[PDB]
Design a protein around this ligand. Structure first.
Ligand SMILES: CC(C)Oc1ccc(Cl)c2cc(C(=N)N)sc12
Ligand SMILES: CC(C)Oc1ccc(Cl)c2cc(C(=N)N)sc12
Ligand SMILES: CC(C)Oc1ccc(Cl)c2cc(C(=N)N)sc12
Ligand SMILES: CC(C)Oc1ccc(Cl)c2cc(C(=N)N)sc12
Ligand SMILES: [Cl-]
Ligand SMILES: [Cl-]
Lengths: 10, 228, 228, 10
């Protein structure tokens, strides 16, 4: 998974 | 709905408590109730809404990926249970999109709120696209693209290139391009131009704004490093 | 109930999938449905049941502690939300105790199953005791003690001192003594005698049994180190 | 919290 905004909840 | 008898202020207070307790489903339900009071949300409240649902859908996405991987290796129980998680995920995305369209986006006039909500609309259509198949996939993808594009147009005209909302939007739209739209070159171009234009504007910021902006720039760099 | 139309075998398979996906609420609901089929559970199935509910109640306990801490610092929203989490926690404990009493314990004849379930009964009364106040607290505490004691009596007569179920029971009963019954000396005595008697029996084990037993002995040592 | 059996889920 690539970095996206906000909590890295997955 | 179920939070209709609770004061707006108590729902916000309880959302913050839920966050501290890492009870994100509760946090999301409190913020949904707060939205349904019909008043616009403050910056802090928008962030509580986003953090809550991001954590909820994040758990579902991770679970869906685990089950999808097992299913593919297997190729009715695995398919049935993957479908169950998938439907729950779609339900959460549907709920968030419903809040945005009734009536958060239409009442959002300031750039910071309008861009924030349109980015969320892009994000939750993107989460739908991750599990979509076929033609529904095409229309879902175009709905994500359309929301991101409107958000980007406003952000470029109304916010400085270091604005964290603008930066986070560009970050997510570039991942949309890379992962969803099968447009890796567009993803790389967007992440690079966003990073470079923010770097050139850092001299205008206070130490605290500098820290906020450079944190998201680092995520852009992390992706570029994996992509180039 | 809600899982009544699903095959026992599919519920077990889906419980294992849920575990892999870290969907512990689903895992617990699948195992509850499997229990309600009325057949005794295998060793693996008992462990799936325990792992599922331990993860669910564990999240609730952690959340309850966060909110209780905030409430105490504050001394209606904090109290109301702590109560909400507390009632949900009590509901999960009630559900587990209900499964044990209808009819897992009464059909468990072998030591390994009977001790396992009686330890669970002790554990979930202990979780109730953590949030209980006053006299209800006293009766809850005595129900935990009674279940642990019957489990201990059987375990000492029917299992070797290195048996992981016996070891885990003694570990939990010693924490009951320390934290719940305000009997730190009893807790320390139990943890020490359990550790020492297991050590003396390690020579009888295979390398894999050795690893299983020493893992729980290390938890006994961790507690003794904090207690002495 | 002291060590107890099984998943350390709290
Ligand atoms: C407007 C200020 C006071 O509130 C915020 C701004 C930006 C962010 Cl990212 C944020 C995250 C928050 C949370 N997780 N509770 S509050 C909050
Ligand atoms: C073809 C696309 C647009 O269709 C969907 C598929 C699945 C879901 Cl959950 C969903 C939710 C939607 C909404 N609330 N606006 S559209 C939509
Ligand atoms: C009887 C054997 C085959 O099954 C087990 C024994 C002991 C434990 Cl601790 C355990 C935990 C399990 C899980 N989390 N799926 S299965 C399982
Ligand atoms: C005074 C004690 C024995 O009372 C309780 C308080 C709270 C709960 Cl959740 C509960 C569940 C119980 C069960 N299912 N056997 S007894 C009990
Ligand atoms: Cl299912
Ligand atoms: Cl509440």
């Amino acid at each position: 998974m690539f970095k996206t905004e906000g909590p890295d909840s997955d | 709905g179920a939070m209709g008898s609770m004061e707006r202020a108590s729902l916000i207070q309880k959302a913050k408590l839920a966050e501290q307790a890492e009870r994100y489903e509760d946090m999301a339900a409190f913020m949904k109730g707060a939205v349904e009071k019909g008043e616009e949300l403050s910056c802090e409240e928008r962030n509580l809404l986003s953090v809550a649902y991001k954590n909820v859908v994040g758990g579902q996405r991770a679970a869906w990926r685990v089950l999808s991987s097992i299913e593919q290796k297997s190729n009715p129980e695995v398919r049935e249970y993957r479908e169950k998680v998938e439907t729950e995920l779609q339900g959460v995305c549907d709920t968030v999109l419903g809040l945005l369209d009734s009536h958060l986006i239409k009442e959002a006039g300031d750039a910071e709120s309008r861009v924030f909500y349109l980015k969320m609309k892009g994000d939750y259509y993107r989460y739908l696209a991750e599990v979509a198949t076929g033609d529904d996939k095409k229309r879902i993808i175009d709905s994500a693209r359309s929301a991101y594009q409107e958000a980007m147009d406003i952000s470029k005209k109304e916010m400085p290139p270091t604005n964290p909302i603008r930066l986070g939007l560009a970050l997510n739209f570039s991942v949309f391009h890379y992962e969803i739209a099968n447009s890796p070159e567009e993803a790389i171009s967007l992440a690079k131009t966003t990073f470079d234009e923010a770097m050139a504007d850092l001299h205008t910021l206070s130490e605290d704004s500098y820290k906020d902006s450079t944190l998201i720039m680092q995520l852009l760099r992390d992706n570029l490093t994996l992509w180039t």
